[PDB]
Design a protein around this nucleic acid. Sequence first.
RNA 1: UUCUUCUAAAAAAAA
RNA 2: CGGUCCGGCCGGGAACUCAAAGGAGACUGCCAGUGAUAAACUGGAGGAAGGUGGGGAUGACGUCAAGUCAUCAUGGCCCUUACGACCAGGGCUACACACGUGCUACAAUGGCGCAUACAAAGAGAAGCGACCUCGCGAGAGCAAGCGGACCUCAUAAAGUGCGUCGUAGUCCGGAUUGGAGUCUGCAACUCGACUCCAUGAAGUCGGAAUCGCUAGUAAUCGUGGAUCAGAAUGCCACGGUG
Lengths: 208, 116, 127, 83, 151, 100, 99
Amino acid sequence: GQKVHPNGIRLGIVKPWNSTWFANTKEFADNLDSDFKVRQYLTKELAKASVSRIVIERPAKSIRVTIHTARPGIVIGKKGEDVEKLRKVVADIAGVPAQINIAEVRKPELDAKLVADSITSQLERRVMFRRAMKRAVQNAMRLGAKGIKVEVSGRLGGAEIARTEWYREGRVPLHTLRADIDYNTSEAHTTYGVIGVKVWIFKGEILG
Amino acid sequence: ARIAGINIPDHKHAVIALTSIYGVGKTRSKAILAAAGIAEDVKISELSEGQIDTLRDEVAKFVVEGDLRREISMSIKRLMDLGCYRGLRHRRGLPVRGQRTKTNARTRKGPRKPIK
Amino acid sequence: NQYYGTGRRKSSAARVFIKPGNGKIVINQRSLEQYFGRETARMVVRQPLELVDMVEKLDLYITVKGGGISGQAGAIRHGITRALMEYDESLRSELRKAGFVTRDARQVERKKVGLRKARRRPQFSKR
Amino acid sequence: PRSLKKGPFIDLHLLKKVEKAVESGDKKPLRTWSRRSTIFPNMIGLTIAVHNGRQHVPVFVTDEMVGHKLGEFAPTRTYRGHA
Amino acid sequence: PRRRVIGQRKILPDPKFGSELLAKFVNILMVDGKKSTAESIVYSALETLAQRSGKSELEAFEVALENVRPTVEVKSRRVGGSTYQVPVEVRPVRRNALAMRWIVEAARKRGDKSMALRLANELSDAAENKGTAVKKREDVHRMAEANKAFA
Amino acid sequence: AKQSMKAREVKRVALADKYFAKRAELKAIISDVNASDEDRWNAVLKLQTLPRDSSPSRQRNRCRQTGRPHGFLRKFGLSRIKVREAAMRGEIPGLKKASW
Amino acid sequence: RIRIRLKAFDHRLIDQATAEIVETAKRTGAQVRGPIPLPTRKERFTVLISPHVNKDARDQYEIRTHLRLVDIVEPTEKTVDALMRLDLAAGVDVQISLG
RNA sequence: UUCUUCUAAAAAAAA
RNA sequence: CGGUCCGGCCGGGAACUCAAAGGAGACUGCCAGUGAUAAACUGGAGGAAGGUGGGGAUGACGUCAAGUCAUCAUGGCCCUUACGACCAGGGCUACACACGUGCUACAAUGGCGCAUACAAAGAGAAGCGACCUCGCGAGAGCAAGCGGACCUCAUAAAGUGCGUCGUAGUCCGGAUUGGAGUCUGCAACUCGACUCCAUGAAGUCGGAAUCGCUAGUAAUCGUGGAUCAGAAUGCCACGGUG
């Protein structure tokens, strides 16, 4: 590991924060801890549902969290049934009144987190890693992405010695700061250990 | 020019010369000269016997070499025969104020003894 | 009717004001010799005013903040040059040759991770 | 050392124990782990087994040990030399 | 170094006399960035040198410097199997640098009370063609003479 | 870190809040110059009887997500490793790699 | 007089917010001094990035706390009720201080 | 001009 | 400018320092020469900055089965009345020796005493803590202000002027040790920091060897912060001389 995190290095240029609120040092730590608890609970609950991003923001002593997911029908089901069930328990955990909005993610094949979860699920159900990597790259490149690079690492195909494989089509400029590289990772808990998946998606240079 | 039973220097200034006595540093010398009404920049020479007598009387109020060495040795001996931790550390010849001993204990241990 | 200039150096900021007069130099309501006891400082302050022969034909009202002795002195020189360039508008061709108009931008280099100072690396040992 | 205005420190259990000991006049050694307590005048002539991390070393309290802490007379490091 | 010969940086002259090489001298003499202390020392040394010489401080400093400036020095080449000390002529800036450095290092070794007094005595002896600084000059000259065969 | 260590931390912080007022009162009595020697003596004797874990000095700030006792940061409540992970993922607002 | 203090981690957001405040004051009443920029607090941290042992491998982070000051010289009732009832975007902290 | 030597256990892919 | 308790302090003024936000500006853009009618290089004109203006972030495919199963996650092996769990006391601070990285020095470019001048960047509510009184001092009592361009840490030091010391193991250097204390914390014995009095080892520029640095750099002088109840000569930043 040598390369700095792409979303971190772009946090003030082209990428927004996943939690946008203000807090003084007295309540900064417990606010961060509350954000961690709600993120952990949501990620645990909505495992089947393809959740891409959990944006948190707290205006005027009331938390409002907006989940970005590609399957809103699955997360809402019948109209207004489990969204309130999630909102009440989140408000109880944080101890402050909550409000949960949901943003649909158009084109889920170009979202770094969703591709990572898809690859990781396929790995967990034992498909050929090369096949999964090729399918993901072809689907992404067909939907109009300017470039994707995927990397899979560790005990591939039930081998004895771990190795790293990676593919890259198109441009993936990691040194260019204005390039909105969507980056995310995941991990598969297979019966031979844990396999790590990393994915960079270059959507086109942002001017300004 | 002879204070507390020992001979102090003469060409040196009074405030410096008084420190030669075992039991008198710079501040105590300053306090002595202040009580005796003697300036600090004057030397031990070109000073009257009456002034030197006042200096002797002033230094007499404190504890100087004779009983000071006795009481210091008495305290150290007290610790050693008392059997306290400081006593054991003193008799073993190692630092007693809780310093490191793995290295840098040269003042209490003397020069290095090579392995034979 | 005053003529103003601004001079800067390492961390200092000098504001100078020029008024025609006999040649009185006052810094922070103190004389030049009173404020800058260091002779090199006195020389660098007087350097533009003795390069162009206007030493006794005008008075200097100076106020300076931040920095150290040499920094404030250099800032004062920079301010005098900048103020003269607009007071006269023809002295620039000589001050530029003398290297007075240029703002010395050599700041103190920041300390860096792994280094003990700005550029001093810690002592290295092979064995 | 401890500030004078706060007074000396001694564990309450040890304090009750030495009180019972001086009242009944018994001469059995009082074993304790209280290495951090200062010596009081009534404790003279008593034998206290101070812990040293491994065993209870018996120490005979004399009148010259009042201002010290009990742990000074029960060394915890064992050393006999290197050669 | 390897790629580019850098451009020479400017030095402002001393305040009292407006001399360039005297300012260079104070730069060489300074230790721990205390230029003010170094300036006081050199000024006191010059002020007593003026009395002992009867000439102006600039002229006395220059005549003292001239007896310490070398004209040839040895430089290692080692093209053969051993160290070849080749005598090469010295350019003026380096000549002045060597003279000032030798004078300063000699004054730092003398046993007088103050550095100002040490520097004054060293300058007077140098003008008088004596001292360890001019001894070092004769030594390097003698070495260059003995190794004059290589060029 | 161990679950035992996290349990010790929560137990210590609970006892500290439980006995916070009494310890404060006792320390005020001891530190008071206008108090008799006997009441100050009783206060220093009473102070020992309280549970040791109730003192504020007994706790060591651990990372709220993993209980790591080293490399803590008070503003974030996490260790250096978790702070870096959270920063690079975007969970801590207004945080980014500085350069000057 | 009423003083409003705005604190935020995003400068573009705080600029938009302060422009909104002066606009909403200027519409209902008047006599707003102006949007004074107060000094930004740059709180820096330095953390070891290796999990076990690399003392010379560290990151240097900072949190810029941008600050703005606005105030109404003589506030009316239709100014004070409006700015009380009005709410702003998350990430901005307002501080009301009368007198 | 001279400048010697490093014993004895590794693993790497199979549309 | 009008007044002053002479203090930007107060009416005031929005010019300036400075505080942020937006924009302009540096691009071999122009000129001369060399060059293959090229890329490019050398020089100067303007300009605060000239060819990457200075510094930082940014570390390719991979290398060392490099480092971490003791941050965490995790496959397998091992223990389950113990290899799990709680508590007191001890140890991580031991000491014939060897090495690595520093701090303070061996002195007059200095030590001590008095007077005096110029900073930057941070932190602060279980917190920073003015002013006044007591103590030689560390500090204690009472106690305003400050969630902070306001108040506090906080008088920067080297410098400069005067006086003394006169090449000495010294008015250099502070180790070590005895006595008396302050603060934090239930609790300073092992094993904290600091203060007062006394003590004043080695050390007079360092063998073979070896390290950092090309400009605001090296060298040198202080200041702040993280960790933290208390506890840095370390680390991460900041300015002064240079």
